[PDB]
């Protein structure tokens, strides 16, 4: 089955660099796009770029395209990012991702490269609720401009797990259970769980597939009391 198994984490100093790799079993990075995502205290998650490994082509946001440089080896199937002359900025988890829509949607995910260093613009509401057993939750998010509908969903659980759940506004991936739901159109989409159980404590959040580069929104906490 499909796997991306990320590198350990990195422990340096200021002004080293860093390569941080991926590799996929179960699949040919060959057949996909490999995208990497930053998760930062500071910005929440920021899509930093991708490759195509087939051609080696790559797209970047040009927010990173000075720190971040990402490359792949078909033979080995694995994907890397490249940061360089690291300051505490850049002190983050890094995702690698597959997508074979390019940005369209990230069906699968890495757990996630820890780093110590020692445009369409998505918000989400609530940013934090607690919620009971069985109760019915609804979260919300605004696009700056219309997305026609390309709007997913991810569940971030407490351990680092990252999932797609729902895709194009309302398209429920693979295993994901009926009590999850999505609605909306234009620039204001919600997600709603109806029959809240034990494990939905998650991170969720919301991303647009439409616009280059895809951005994320800043997520919403989910708790259980």
């Known amino acids: 089955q499909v796997q991306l198994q990320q590198s350990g984490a990195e422990v340096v100093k200021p002004g080293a660099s860093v390569k941080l790799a991926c590799t996929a079993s179960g699949f040919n990075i060959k057949d996909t796009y490999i995208h990497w995502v930053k998760q930062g205290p500071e910005q929440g998650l920021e899509w930093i770029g991708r490759i195509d490994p087939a051609n080696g082509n790559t797209k970047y946001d040009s927010k990173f395209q000075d720190k971040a440089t990402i490359t792949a080896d078909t033979s080995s199937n694995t994907a890397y990012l490249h940061l360089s002359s690291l300051t505490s900025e850049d002190t983050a988890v890094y995702y690698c991702?597959?997508?074979?829509?390019?940005?369209?949607?990230?069906?699968?995910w890495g757990q996630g490269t820890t780093v110590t260093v020692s445009d369409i613009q998505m918000t989400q509401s609530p940013s934090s609720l607690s919620a009971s057993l069985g109760d019915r939750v609804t979260i919300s998010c605004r696009a700056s401009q219309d997305i026609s509908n390309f709007l997913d969903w991810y569940q971030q659980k407490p351990d680092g797990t990252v999932k797609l759940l729902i895709y194009?506004?309302?398209r429920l991936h693979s295993g994901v259970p009926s009590r999850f739901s999505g609605s909306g159109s234009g620039t204001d989409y919600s997600l709603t769980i109806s029959k809240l159980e034990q494990e939905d404590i998650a991170t969720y959040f919301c991303?647009?597939?439409?616009?280059?580069?895809?951005?994320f929104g800043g997520g919403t906490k989910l708790e259980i009391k």
């Open positions: 991702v597959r997508g074979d829509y390019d940005y369209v949607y990230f069906d699968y």
């Open positions: 194009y506004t309302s």
């Open positions: 991303q647009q597939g439409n616009t280059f580069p895809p951005t």
